[PDB]
Amino acid sequence: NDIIKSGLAEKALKALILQCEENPSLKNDKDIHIIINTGKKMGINRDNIPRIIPLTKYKLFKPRDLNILLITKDPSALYRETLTKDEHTSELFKEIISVKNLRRRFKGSKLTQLYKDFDLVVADYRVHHLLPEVLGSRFYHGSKKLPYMIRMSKEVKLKRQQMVEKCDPIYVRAQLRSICKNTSYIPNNDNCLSVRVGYIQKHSIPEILQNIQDTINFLTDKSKRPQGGVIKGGIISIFVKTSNSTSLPIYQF
């Protein structure tokens, strides 16, 4: 909670918020990211699988707010029928598409259009590792729209047995609420790390400052491994920036 108390963090974010209003080039930059300088090499290769950081005090977003695309295993008839009919998940998804239907229909410039129209991409964990070839480089470069893996039903797979296929609407809605409200991060084999913490014009300065503390606690807490506690050896420094604005320091060791 020290990072909240220090006035520099408040001063930086106020400067950043004033800037995005003034400079035209930053008119389209809406997200606030924190750049954390891990002391040592984390040593985790970038697997392109987002890891969710629980933000307890506040919720970043609600699933209703964003365009959500669901990529399922073939056939999508079962999942599409189950999700669409159930009231809770009836309107939850902007579109539901199977992997092969995704590969066939969208290619080239269509892939770029898909990127603009959808704000969140979620896929069954089975088909996630196939997505990098299908979605393309634009989705998997920069981590803004990197897909989030989800599980359709609470059933588990066992050796030498066949997993029973089911779609559980209430379970599915539970994850997407977790995904949208909580922030996420992707490990990489270098000091740096970027985690979204707030959205400009929606989150007040205390909220962003509180969210930053949540990110620091979960990420340094060894008890939360393997999802958390990946920054071993302390943090040299933290910055705050938008997509195009520069790095403003908020904590230095």
Partner: peptide, 24 residues
Amino acid sequence: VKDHRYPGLTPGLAPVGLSDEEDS
């Protein structure tokens, strides 16, 4: 929860909480 085919399930799974399950 772990799936032997996809080790990527275990890390970066969405945590599910009581508030999430409850309807709006």
